Amino acid sequence: QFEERHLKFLQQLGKGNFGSVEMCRYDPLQDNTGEVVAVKKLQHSTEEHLRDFEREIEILKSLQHDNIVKYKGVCYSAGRRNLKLIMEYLPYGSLRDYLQKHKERIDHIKLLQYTSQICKGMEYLGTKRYIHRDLATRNILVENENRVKIGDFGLTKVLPQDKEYYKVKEPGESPIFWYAPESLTESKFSVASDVWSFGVVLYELFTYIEKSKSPPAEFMRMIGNDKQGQMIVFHLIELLKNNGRLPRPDGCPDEIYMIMTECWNNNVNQRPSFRDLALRVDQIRDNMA
Numbered sequence: 001q002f003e004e005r006h007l008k009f010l011q012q013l014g015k016g017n018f019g020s021v022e023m024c025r026y027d028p029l030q031d032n033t034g035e036v037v038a039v040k041k042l043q044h045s046t047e048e049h050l051r052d053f054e055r056e057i058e059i060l061k062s063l064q065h066d067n068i069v070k071y072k073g074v075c076y077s078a079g080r081r082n083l084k085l086i087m088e089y090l091p092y093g094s095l096r097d098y099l100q101k102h103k104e105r106i107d108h109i110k111l112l113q114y115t116s117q118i119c120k121g122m123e124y125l126g127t128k129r130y131i132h133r134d135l136a137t138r139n140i141l142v143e144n145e146n147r148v149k150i151g152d153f154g155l156t157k158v159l160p161q162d163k164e165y166y167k168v169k170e171p172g173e174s175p176i177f178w179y180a181p182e183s184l185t186e187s188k189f190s191v192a193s194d195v196w197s198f199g200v201v202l203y204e205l206f207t208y209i210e211k212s213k214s215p216p217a218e219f220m221r222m223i224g225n226d227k228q229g230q231m232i233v234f235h236l237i238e239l240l241k242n243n244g245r246l247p248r249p250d251g252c253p254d255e256i257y258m259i260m261t262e263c264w265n266n267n268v269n270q271r272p273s274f275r276d277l278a279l280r281v282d283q284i285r286d287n288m289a
């Protein structure tokens with residue numbers, strides 16, 4: 001639907017490093033009335049990355065939910081080379097940056113509003129048997145002060161019809177400090193490992209993204225900052241096997257930390273569902289108000 005010649009570059013919005021997202025104006029009438037949109041492209045367009053990007057595009061196109069960023073279309077030059085994904089532009093950036101910038105004015109009730117929206121978006125993914133695999137506040141976007149959306153799906157996979165997990169190992173750096181133990185040890189991804197990562201998201205929110213309190217900083221402190229390369233993963237695995245966990249964030253109530261620790265269960269089958277997480281968050285939020 002979109003022609004590359006009418007996309008005017010304005011700035012880069014994010015880089016995630018087989019791809020990037022740009023802010024552009026789509027101005028087909030060339031009179032500066034077109035709308036500002038978000039444009040995702042590959043940073044190094046190998047055939048493998050292009051096949052993955054096509055699947056990512058189909059996944060996002062199949063999703064319609066208030067808390068999932070909106071698909072708008074695709075753009076390609078040449079024949080079908082230079083594939084680009086066109087999405088709605090969300091003006092407040094990632095939740096990670098937004099939260100950090102406004103920490104003094106965002107209270108716990110608001111954090112739980114965001115939490116509940118994230119759980120509803122994730123439950124919807126689950127109804128389609130999609131596994132996000134990269135849940136983190138850097139992959140959540142803020143549309144306005146009352147609404148966030150899951151904002152990136154570059155690692156999302158569809159479960160096989162006959163299995164409840166998807167086994168995949170990418171080359172290179174993986175966000176290991178958000179990974180469930182079974183993703184670290186067996187490369188198994190499932191709704192339940194998304195629930196583990198959601199617990200880490202909840203942790204991030206209640207730390208208000210304070211620098212020294214990030215999951216990597218906390219876990220590296222727990223394993224020893226001396227550790228390097230491949231040993232980091234090994235020690236993380238052992239740390240999690242021994243029920244080492246991220247600490248309760250400053251100011252976080254016990255009942256919210258308990259949601260985190262229940263998501264961080266070593267037993268995959270005992271982690272809560274996204275519907276129950278949303279139910280519990282909404283009950284705490286009602287109580288607080």
Ligand SMILES: N#CC[C@H](C1CCCC1)n1cc(-c2ncnc3[nH]ccc23)cn1
Pocket residue numbers: 013014015016017019020021038069087088089090091093094138139140141150151152154
């Ligand atoms: N979410 C998320 C992270 C994602 C980066 C991670 C991988 C490529 C870019 N990203 C998307 C954006 C963005 N910003 C503003 N409006 C948008 N709409 C669709 C994506 C998007 C900024 N960074």
